[model samples]
Target: HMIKVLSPAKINLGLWVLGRLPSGYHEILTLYQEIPFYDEIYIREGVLRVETNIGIPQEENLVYKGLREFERITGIEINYSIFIQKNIPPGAGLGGGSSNLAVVLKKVNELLGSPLSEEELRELVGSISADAPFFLLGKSAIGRGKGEVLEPVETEISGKITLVIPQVSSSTGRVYSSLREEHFVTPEYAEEKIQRIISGEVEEIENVLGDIARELYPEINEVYRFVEYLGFKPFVSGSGSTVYFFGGASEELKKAAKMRGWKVVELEL
Candidate 1:
């Protein structure tokens, strides 16, 4: 059976990095909002092959890693022809790669006659990415503790989310390494800030990592300045090359980004 799926992308509404963990993952508290921006995946029966717009070594790809991990735990080997129309930009803090991994694993689990439970699937994807489990949840969430500890927080954000994606890639590892005592918040502080947003006390708080990334990537700062020029308050998504805000992009804003050869996308949350 051939199956096609739209793997959705996500944005961090507010991300607070509390501290560095021994596991090499920085402790974080953030709201993950699923958006309609997607990568397309098509899977069907054939000798195993994975095709994507961006060419990379076969075994190193997340899809291969995820499927292999699934086999390691379930003992069910899956070999299928897979094609991916990858649209969402990687290293934009959009979680596109992780989203693709979750969708592939989800469908693989079903194609294998559902041997793994949802809980088991979530736990398994953690080995692939800290963001992969949340993608499987397929909804907005409050993610904490390396983003594995998730609490579903659903609410109408009531506006279109507009994004200006800079071509520059912000390395997640480099950004995390640049973070020091200034970026670290207490767990209690992070908890309180997240709770206020969950209760709708604030529409949007902030992503502390945004500033850190801005310091490193001049292109991000350039986009931020443009967003501010267009009179929209810009917020970074994850450790980002994507600058986002709480409304639709105006024509002038789109034109401005176009001139800069930047990509603009808008979505309703």
Candidate 2:
């Protein structure tokens, strides 16, 4: 009976795209946020053995493709012995393998007795991604369409966020193959930057998506302008290398992110 689960760390907080879906997948509107930096799984009792410290790929592990789509949508021959512990940072769009395949398919469908319904466990966590049905519920949400249409949004947002990971590794299809075909900004500047982040005015929210991921990545915009010149409004969290920030002067941006060696994480969201 070894359960365990976690897999947290979402945090898009404002994505917005709203167009592009002849099934090419776009029409988004985002705001995920479930941080506490997680990633730990277990599950025991047996022969289905899949594991990972971070090598990933028990058949392209998204928790083994959500336990093979929860055994072909529940014919029910469930097995276990899986284990993961990757501490989130694969491609840094940061849903960390779709929130570890929605917390291991909601703890293997509550150990096999929960016959799925919370809208069928959010339609099997939207068939396993688009932020896995907003981690099965909320802390903050709004994602739409191909981002799997969630809706809960209340955002109180306190302090400490600080991520920063720039040693390079980005390819959300080369940052959506560098967008800019004249999409400079104005859907009322993404709905007045989501009503100035729901009116707490989280520094009037900014990310114009890292200038096309800083022209296809220049150390992800030099660690997002070196954590925004040590002040802290630095962005780049969705489609590029991770560079984050929030407030209360994040330990002077974590000693200016270790004097630029870069790889920090301060969490408390």
Candidate 3:
């Protein structure tokens, strides 16, 4: 039997850097929302194989690593082939790679007679990528502890989301490493911010690492400026080269972004 899955991309509605942990990872409080943008994956029983359109090396691919790790954890001699139809761009902070790992993990567990519980699945995902756990849970949630810990949040964000991808790309690792002491903030007020947004008292969203990202890739700020010119509040999605604006002006935003030689996608929240 074969199965296909739609792995959707995620954007951080709000992200704050709480502090750096003793484990050498940054502690973050962020809101994650899955978008309509997706990559498709097909899985079937066979000798293990992996393929993708993104030009990622098989050995370095997260799907391959996830399959091997699943086998290692379960001690079940399983063989399957996975083919990925890539849509989301890498280093754009859309969580495409992490979603790929999540789909593989879920399918593998289902194929193996459902031996693992949800908690076990979350642990396995945490071992793979910070964003994988969120994909497994799906929908809007708050992420903490290197982004593995999650708490689902119910939110109603009205309007369309316009995602503009610049020609430049960002390295999440590089962006985090560029952080200074001034970038750190206390998470004590995170709940208040989350509540305000949920209650519609706050219309503008903030991303703590956005300035650092703009510093690393000037094109990101340029895109932000262009979006601002279009009469929308621009925010970076995670540590990103992708800038998003929320409003009802989808058609005009699309035209402006294209004229500026940037790739654009309109998404429904």
Candidate 4:
């Protein structure tokens, strides 16, 4: 039996760092939206083979980790070959790795004849990656508490988003480490702000890590400036090397991206 799935990427419409928890994980408030960008995964019973176009260490690969964890919890003694057709780039803050993990969980659970409930599957995925659980739900939601706690939000943002992926990569760990005490903000009235943004009462969306990420990766700022020069508000998605503008890409924009040797894609959400 074979199962193939499309692992969708995610972008944070708004991300706020509330504070650091005693566990060393930062408390966060963010709005998560799944994008049309996806990675393809092929699954079937085998001797635990995993392959990808990108060179990722076996132990460090989220798909491998997810499958191992699933086997551990279910004790199903399953051996599967997983093949990934990489489209979403890693370290682009598009939740590619997390999405892979979620897809693995879902496929494995399905193969096991529904051994795990949705809640259990989410709990398992949460332990693997903070953003993994969100992919399971696959909708716009508000995330809090290490981004595992989620509440689905009402949003009607549908358009072609121009995504620019620079040659440089942003390290999520380093980006989080660069944050200081001053960077921490209270998430008070976050729900209100989220509602306003959903209702179109707010035009400007802010990402708490945007400035820090831009500082960490100068290319991010360069991309932001380039997008802004094209007359659109460029926003950094999560901790990013990918800068996105809410609109279709122009011919000039494509030309500039080609000249800069950056990857560009049009995504509709």
Alpha carbon deviation, residue 62, candidate 3 (Å): 1.2
How do the predictions measure up, each by TM-score? 0.95, 0.34, 0.94, 0.96
Stronger candidate by TM-score (2 vs 4): 4
What is the C-alpha lDDT profile of model 4 across 17-105, one tens digit per residue? Answer: 98888887799988898988889999878898778888877788888887787778888777888888889998898999999998887
Candidate 1 lDDT over 72-173, as tens digits, reads: 888877788888888898888999889988998889888889999998988888777999999988777999889878889766465677988988988989
Per-residue lDDT of model 2, residues 1-269, tens digit only: 78787788776766656455576656655566777888788779787767889677688777777777778887787688888887777876677787777777777787778877668877876775677778877477766666677777777677788788776677776665455536444455676677568656676655545557777878778878877777667766678678777844457656766786567877876
Winner on lDDT between 3 and 4 is 4
Candidate 1 residue 199 Cα shift, in angstroms, is: 4.0
* Whole-structure CA lDDT of model 1: 0.85
Error of 2 at 216 (Å): 31
What TM-score does candidate 1 reach? 0.95
The 10 consecutive residues of candidate 2 with the worst lDDT sum are: 177-186
List ranges where model 3 is wrong by over 4 Å. Answer: 248-256, 259-261
**Top model by TM-score, which number?**
4
- Candidate 4 worst ten-residue window by lDDT: 196-205
Q: How close is candidate 4 to the true structure, as a TM-score?
A: 0.96
lDDT of 3 by residue, 1-269 (tens): 88898999999887888888887779898888889999999998999988898688989898898878778888887788888998888888899899999978888888889878888988888887999999998888888888899989888785688889887878998999988898877887776676666655435468867889998899888988888888878889989988898865467766776787677978777
